[PDB]
Amino acid sequence: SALGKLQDVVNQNAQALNTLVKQLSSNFGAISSVLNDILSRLDPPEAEV
């Protein structure tokens, strides 16, 4: 644990990137989190929503 100050910054940046990548898996109230599924399932008036 001698080099914990640099490893803390590295872990925080990697964890922020992992959270930002993980946030793509959430649909945020939509029917799906995948854009291609929405674009292949729905007409543009509701796919727009």
């Binding site: 959270t19 993980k22 946030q23 898996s25 959430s26 649909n27 945020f28 109230g29």
Partner: protein, 170 residues
């Protein structure tokens, strides 16, 4: 306690985890700040029972034995002058231990000079410590020694004016 609200909140992902982690980082940063400010000594120093410092009076800044909080009169005045899922975490260092740290720093800088901050605490008489400080600002030791009563009286008067100004300014 609404379960439908939490079921809809799970659609937004790990926002709550990020907010909790940011607040946890702030909470440990406050304790790290207090640790860096006050815990600069690993030896808890005490003043001698006899307060013979060559006329210099430190009673307004040394801890009062009559008070149960073991605070100085100035520190006691300072503490008197400051007045749904929410929780307040207590600080890691209590006010008694912060007062103990400041008491140790005061005892070190009174009895040992700046020597305790660079190594072992080496005792030195306070009218000699003061002469060393006078030589640090480029004034000869003799000036301090010849006028030691006037400097002690000025220091005690200034400390009393500090207490009066803190007690008289909101």
């Amino acid at each position: 306690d609404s379960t439908e609200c939490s079921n809809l909140l799970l659609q937004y992902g790990s926002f709550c985890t990020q907010l909790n982690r940011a607040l946890t980082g702030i909470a440990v940063e406050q304790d790290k700040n207090t640790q860096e400010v006050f815990a600069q000594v690993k030896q808890i120093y005490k003043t001698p029972p006899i307060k013979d410092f060559g006329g210099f009076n430190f009673s307004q800044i040394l801890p009062d034995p009559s008070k149960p909080s073991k605070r100085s009169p100035i520190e006691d005045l300072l503490f008197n002058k400051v007045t749904n899922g929410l929780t307040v975490l207590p600080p890691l260092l209590t006010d008694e231990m912060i007062a103990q740290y400041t008491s140790a720093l005061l005892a070190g800088t009174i009895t040992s000079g700046w020597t305790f901050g660079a190594g072992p605490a080496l005792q030195i008489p306070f009218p000699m410590q003061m002469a060393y400080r006078f030589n640090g600002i480029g004034v000869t030791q003799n000036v301090l020694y010849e006028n030691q009563k006037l400097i002690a009286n000025q220091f005690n008067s200034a400390i009393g004016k500090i207490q009066d100004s803190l007690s008289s300014t909101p």
